[model samples]
Target: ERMYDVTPPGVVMGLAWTAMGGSTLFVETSLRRPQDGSLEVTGQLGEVMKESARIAYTFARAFLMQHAPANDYLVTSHIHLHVPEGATPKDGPSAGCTIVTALLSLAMGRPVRQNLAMTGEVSLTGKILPVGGIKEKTIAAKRAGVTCIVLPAENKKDFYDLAAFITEGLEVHFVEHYREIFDIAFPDE
Candidate 1:
């Protein structure tokens, strides 16, 4: 009863900004023994986000090769990353890190930090790229009761100029790569 919520591996909470306001988005992923290493993304995502899923898969693949069993199923399996709210269309690179985190959690069967939520774009080579709407995204995470907010390191400069009330009492992390997120989200494993 003390932990507060279900701990599910392969599912991560991502901060998002909508035309209406800031909100929380869920990124879910899975591994299947498909014939090839194909990435299946659903939930009406746009092109950029679809590409984001691909980059996340490739990054997860490399991370596992270096960290897991040599014959891990993930190395030869198909990956699926999905962002729900199927009726609404979503697109952006902002969810890149979120997707990657979910994939990493899936591949390793580790649960993500319960109080953590993050935003950032990810490159194919595992670099965490910067995304826009830092202020809005920060507000979203805080409102969702996420204790730790992770941002792309490049956004730290912008946060310095944010309203103090928006950041007071919040634990924020800045990262330049997904590796940092992995260390923080699944420390024991």
Candidate 2:
């Protein structure tokens, strides 16, 4: 007789590009044996973080339209995104993009493209909103081994005022919609 083992299907580590800096985030998805769909988000999130989750979920559902139209059944599925440090109490809309990527990564059962990190708030309608701390976040992502970064389209002009060293070795993409980011984050897929 042979022994058997069971393990979850997929899991990925996502790097969150934030104004404060880059933090490692884990996005995990597991299949439930039952049919009831439930969503649970953890990690000391605040009102803004909670709202961002809701918005990200909406954007992800829309983004799926191009890849898996008939798979709409996955939309109603439960998603849980925990920022970790659950007791720290985090709040901000800037994580909107990260949240969306994490969720979509799980929904698609695929890893985030590669060498890419992003920061921005996403609207329910799939609009990518501008965030702050461009230089700091960029530097953080670079330090974390990220080669590409997705930033707000409106913030591109701000680069003119930044020091050259701040952008060296980085491929920055300015985007105004969630779909633009979707492409950059999952190019090979």
Candidate 3:
């Protein structure tokens, strides 16, 4: 499927933008049915870009194991991160939050909050790192009818200091840890 049919557990919607226009990117990770804890990242990714996904995977795995200790698949599942537009030359670290959220949703079997979009770099130890393109990504999220935006706490000053006007009336969240994103993104779960 080019996109999901039912917004499955392992899929999370995200927003991205270039110099031209905004585009919707969905982070989808398939559990290769549970194998030897391997990671396969596709979509014309650069070395650094792949590392971004790896960081997210590591964080998500640890988060899942701690929060749901009974979930043995956390260390056994082979993850396949299907990047957006596999044919096009895609590259960026801005997908950190998306990857983490998607993997977390998969491990938890919870749906990410509807009308929610997030962007940030995922670091080890569950820290969310600040990244550029908040303004453009915010515009894209706004256009996509996103009601909430999760941003790294470090970007709060720069975000308020910059020209991020498209976030009007939008529930913007400043988070320092990826665990916050889990709480904010999955309330009932």
Per-structure clash totals for the candidates: 0, 1, 0
lDDT per model vs. reference: 0.80, 0.67, 0.78
Choose 2 or 3, whichever is better by TM-score.
3
Tens-digit lDDT track of model 2 for 76-139: 6755556664575667787787777776676676777656667788998778887766666666
**Model 3: clashing residue pairs?**
none
Which stretches of model 3 miss by more than 4 angstroms? 1-6, 161-165
Model 3, 1-189: lDDT tens per residue?
Answer: 124334678888776667887666788888776344877888887777788888888887888788888886657888788877878666778788889899888777778887777888888888888887777777777776777888889878756764645546889899988888888989886
For model 3, give the 10-residue run with minimal summed lDDT. Answer: 1-10
Q: Each prediction's TM-score against the native?
A: 0.90, 0.80, 0.89
Q: How should the candidates be ordered by lDDT, best one leading? A: 1, 3, 2
In model 1, what lDDT does residue 121 have? 92
Higher-ranked by TM-score: 1 or 3:
1
Error of 2 at 45 (Å): 1.0
